[PDB]
Design a protein around this ligand. Structure first.
Ligand SMILES: CN1C(=O)[C@@H](NC(=O)c2nnc(Cc3ccccc3)[nH]2)COc2ccc(C#CC3CC3)cc21
Ligand SMILES: CN1C(=O)[C@@H](NC(=O)c2nnc(Cc3ccccc3)[nH]2)COc2ccc(C#CC3CC3)cc21
Lengths: 263, 248
């Protein structure tokens, strides 16, 4: 457990930011980190959960660096991703070029393939959980703590990326195909530079529409997105979960396309 | 367009909104949208330019210490369905329909498609005149960004959230409002597919007297094919002489 134990004295300084009690801190040897804190006023179960998450080690997946438990105040600690999340970057003034968007897609695929390979279902894949560093590499995060059972309980949601089978039944068993659907909508957003379903009027309209087969508007991306990716996102958002490909399957389809046409 | 909290003498919370008494311009409804940019002011100014007697006027905005609020006209009797369930004379129901037509024709003339026309967005003043509102911020794009009845939604939008709304989308919603005005009640997955297949509010459940012309109008305006529906100027051309000779 010492592998994930951090102390306030390990950091030179920290300050609260304007979710929840999030702060930016400089670690004495490991650099800038983001800290999320909850006040409670049992700890060993929290530390083991942190140790488990810390074993998810892959270049495109957020590595939990450690936790701090002091004075009834409980913190998770991770590396600071300066450019924020994927949608923040997509909407930036600088228009992200095709070669970069293609690499982002491939890195998302790599990260999700690793997670599923480790038996991890994400359950809330979405642009907000795809973080971007200063060289435009990405890492997959779980900022809503959907996979942190204990740490989520201590703290006591867009539907655009949620698979239709989970619309109105969020307690159904999570599946790998649930994540593949989310990925399909992320693909669309990467080329649209925006959230889907802008012409929806009511939440009930949208939920029923998606369950009936409605999908993001492909006509918004045809002049930017290559045909191969449009075909890919259609496979990945098929209504039948078992008709959706695996992420290793997606990777074997997408990587040679990226290499010859995009890189 | 820009107001300050100091511009108001008194305020009391009203069943995230409050009724406030302005120093010079009188009673207003205030809603704090966000607690915690120039595009917001520009959008507010464009809404302020939507000046018509049957359309709610955005009176101003308050931007103070990270607190963002919209300020609009005060409509004493609440929304249309509240009034319908209160009894409204036929000549007043006819005038209300005509005032909906006027306000919607104005909005369409300005290029504004409402997209969520319904009794809750039709506000009634002390003298039973109406104004059209957008309480769900369907047209307030930038202010909505600071942060669900399907009975009135046209079938071309049911199960297709990507189709662009048009003037005829609002005409369908108007037809169902007509039914509600004389039924005095709200209408009606299984329902959605039924509506998309041609099911409509049951005219036979209107129990009070309703002119044939109004029965025919609501059937015309809720045609499944949007091109079979009239425009609001087309509706006014037919309805105003009817109101003037038979109802006023
Ligand atoms: C400090 N912090 C963390 O360490 C988070 N960790 C993770 O997201 C994560 N860890 N390991 C993984 C890898 C994985 C991915 C999917 C499923 C399973 C595993 N993610 C959890 O709590 C936080 C919440 C929000 C923020 C923020 C912020 C910005 C807005 C200001 C920061 C954290
Ligand atoms: C203060 N306030 C506002 O100003 C609203 N504005 C409007 O609806 C509007 N403004 N100008 C127009 C005219 C138009 C109509 C259609 C399309 C485009 C324009 N509507 C928007 O936010 C609110 C939400 C809810 C309430 C409440 C309440 C009590 C009654 C239950 C109040 C507001």
């Amino acid at each position: 457990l010492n592998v994930i134990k951090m102390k306030s004295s390990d950091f030179l300084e920290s300050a609260e930011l304007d979710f929840g009690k999030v702060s930016l801190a400089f670690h004495r040897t490991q650099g800038l980190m983001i800290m999320k804190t909850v006040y409670k006023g049992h700890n060993e179960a929290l530390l083991e959960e942190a140790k488990m998450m810390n074993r998810l080690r892959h270049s495109r997946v957020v590595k939990l660096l450690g936790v701090i438990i002091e004075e009834g105040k409980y913190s998770l600690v991770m590396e600071y991703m300066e450019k924020g999340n994927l949608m923040h970057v997509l909407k930036a003034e600088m228009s992200t070029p095709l070669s970069v968007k293609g690499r982002i897609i491939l890195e998302i695929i790599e990260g999700m393939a690793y997670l599923h390979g480790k038996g991890v279902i994400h359950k809330d894949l979405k642009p907000e959980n795809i973080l971007v560093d200063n060289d435009f590499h990405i890492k997959i995060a779980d900022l809503g703590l959907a996979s942190f059972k204990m740490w989520s309980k201590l703290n006591n949601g867009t539907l655009y990326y949620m698979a239709p089978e989970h619309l109105n039944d969020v307690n159904a068993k999570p599946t790998e195909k649930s994540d593949v659907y989310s990925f399909a909508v992320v693909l669309w957003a990467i080329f649209a530079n925006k959230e889907p379903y802008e012409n929806a009027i009511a939440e009930q309209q949208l939920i029923m529409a998606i369950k009936s087969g409605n999908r993001p508007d492909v006509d918004d991306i045809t002049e930017y997105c290559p045909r191969e990716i449009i075909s890919l996102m259609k496979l990945c958002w098929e209504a039948n979960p078992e008709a959706r490909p695996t992420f290793p399957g997606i990777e074997e389809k997408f990587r040679p396309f990226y290499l010859s046409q995009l890189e």
